[PDB]
Write a protein that binds this DNA or RNA. Structure first.
Ligand SMILES: [Mn+2]
Ligand SMILES: [Mn+2]
Lengths: 177, 177
DNA sequence: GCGATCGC
DNA sequence: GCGATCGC
């Protein structure tokens, strides 16, 4: 049971974790770089109160997926692993005498803008936008845009470019509903 | 996680739990009856070693589903709730200095033989038999037999009757795959 | 709406 | 094979 947090506390936790994440790769500790850690979920949406903390980790190679989350390490911080696979890992962390939920997710570099778009939410916004695309025989997820189960090769790198390419109005995370 | 245990230890735990399960229903403690508790999973299949304990609880009315697992009580036993809803609840219990996983599932009375058939497994057996039924435009699950998304009203009460009615060879749980 | 990880 | 719970 993870406790509720203020936005401020959430950001403090992210900043702390940003330089302390690593994973064991066949007996070798590999540091995750700050530039490959993206705060997502309600924190990215700037919500005053948070039910947990959510981080998206950008993994440079498909081969590393079997190693990153299943061998996650956080320097100095007390935590326990509840459910964990290659794409989603739920941790319960200790922060200043209180327990909080920390969700970790992984995206490959080529999935990044789709992952950020997905994990930013909110859920109601995703459902709406995915419903509209579904009516045109598209399927959008955290990995790509598909039509008839085939990847649509969009020439984009950022979340804003993706949203514009999908034909939707760009709004900052704070203002997506 | 939960420790492994022998078939003997599993059966001892089931026998203990059999008279100690209850749930709170709007402030009132309602005992679950032994006759409405069925050991399922690898234990029912008589496997020498078990990764956890699995119980199916038969609930007499649809209205009670929102109350049974979300308010489960076990007299005298130390436990913690991991994930939990109306149909599946995972507990970690303390048994003689060791922690074990206890999975609880619910079936309505009219679902019973379908639930027992499903939760008995093994997984490979279910996939095979469901693949064969799917080719004839049926869908089998823990709730019933369906054709064209409509319940096939089979006149059965037991698991053995169901298997016979589906046209498959009845084998004891020990000998299914 | 869609997918991850889990249940058998 | 099919579904539950939980991620956004
Ligand atoms: Mn989360
Ligand atoms: Mn189990």
């Amino acid at each position: 049971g993870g406790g509720m947090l203020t936005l401020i506390q959430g950001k403090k936790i992210v900043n702390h974790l940003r330089s302390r994440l690593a994973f064991e790769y066949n007996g070798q500790l590999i540091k995750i770089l700050s530039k490959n850690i993206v705060a997502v979920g309600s924190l990215r949406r700037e919500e005053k109160m948070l039910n947990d903390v959510n981080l998206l980790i950008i993994v440079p190679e498909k081969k590393l997926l079997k190693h990153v989350l299943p061998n996650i390490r956080i320097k100095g911080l007390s935590f326990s692993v509840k459910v964990c696979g290659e794409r989603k890992c739920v941790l319960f962390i200790e922060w200043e005498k209180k327990t909080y939920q920390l969700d970790l997710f992984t995206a490959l570099a080529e999935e990044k803008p789709y992952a950020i778009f997905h994990f930013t939410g909110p859920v109601s916004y995703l459902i709406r936008i995915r419903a509209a695309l579904k009516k045109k025989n598209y399927k959008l997820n955290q990995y790509g845009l598909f039509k008839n189960q085939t990847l649509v090769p969009l020439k984009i790198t950022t979340e804003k470019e993706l949203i514009k390419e999908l034909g939707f109005t760009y709004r900052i995370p704070k203002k997506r509903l």
